[PDB]
Amino acid sequence: GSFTEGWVRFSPGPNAAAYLTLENPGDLPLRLVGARTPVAERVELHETFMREVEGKKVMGMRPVPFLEVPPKGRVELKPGGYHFMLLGLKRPLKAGEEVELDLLFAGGKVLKVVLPVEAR
Ligand SMILES: [Cu+]
Numbered sequence: 001g002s003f004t005e006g007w008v009r010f011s012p013g014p015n016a017a018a019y020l021t022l023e024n025p026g027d028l029p030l031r032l033v034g035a036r037t038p039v040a041e042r043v044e045l046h047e048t049f050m051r052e053v054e055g056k057k058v059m060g061m062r063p064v065p066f067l068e069v070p071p072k073g074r075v076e077l078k079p080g081g082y083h084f085m086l087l088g089l090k091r092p093l094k095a096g097e098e099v100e101l102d103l104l105f106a107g108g109k110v111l112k113v114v115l116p117v118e119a120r
Pocket of ligand 1: 017061085
């Protein structure tokens with residue numbers, strides 16, 4: 001509580017990406033394995049990283065099976081790394097809009113967030 005928040009990324013095209021702050025209020029660990037949203041057909045769960053090829057340093061991205069958050073702790077889907085990919089959007093979405101995410105937590109759980117959309 002503070003921020004604790006996120007934003008969905010601008011795109012008028014077929015796909016987008018989403019960044020957000022995961023926080024665990026429980027005494028047991030939470031584990032984010034999936035998601036949902038009213039502005040996609042697929043969600044996918046991704047990482048992002050720095051990488052070397054030929055001694056020349058670039059960035060890259062991959063899908064991943066889940067994220068972990070320890071009890072009383074927090075971890076963001078940060079723009080310098082982990083994020084959802086949203087594909088098959090239902091608003092062509094843009095700076096100053098408004099979007100839900102649903103976050104599928106391991107063993108019978110879910111969290112809902114509401115995020116703004118940003119040209120970020
Ligand atoms: Cu991605």
